[PDB]
C-alpha cells in the first residue's frame, strides 16, 4: 500500500543557530511517523519584511498508512493538528514555525 | 541524484462542482512534476466564517530531481514556484488557491 504524505507545516531557525531537531521533535504524532526535511525557504519574506534566507526551513510531513479514501483522513488530520500544535507551542522562541492552521484560505 | 518534494500550497473547489484536475492542471512545471493529493482542509473555516467542508482540498507539491543541497536549490525552487503561481492565476476563480510564495509568516 502507498503511504499518504500529509504536509503539516514548517519549522525554521537561524542558520547561525545550529539546532538538534531530533531533541525537539517526536518521531510520531497521532500514530503516524513524523518526518522533517530541509527545503529552500518557501517564501521570500517574513511578516515584518525580514528576508527568510538567513533561516533554515524544515518541511513537516506525516506518513499516513491507510487504504481508505481521502475523506477518511479527517479524524487523523484533526488529531495531528492538535498534537503537533501542542509540541511546537512548547518550543523555544528562537524556533519559528507554522502549521496548516496558519494557512487561512478564503 | 535526489528526488525532492517541495510543498507549494493548496487548491480547492466546491464539492458540488466536480472538476477534472487532471485536465485543469499541467503535469509539469519548470521541469518539475506537479503532484496534487486530496486531503482534509487545513482549517475548518474560511476567512469569512463559512465552513471549508463545502470544498475539496488538494495539497500541491513540486517533485524536483536535483543534486543540489537545500540552500543551493533556492534559485530553482523560487523559479518553479513562481511558474506554478502563473499557472494558477490562469484558472477560473471557482478554483480557489493559496501558495506559500505569497505568504508572509510570523
Automatic annotation (TrEMBL), chains A, B:
Record InterPro entries: DUF3208
Superkingdom of origin: Bacteria
Protein's name according to its UniProt entry: DUF3208 domain-containing protein
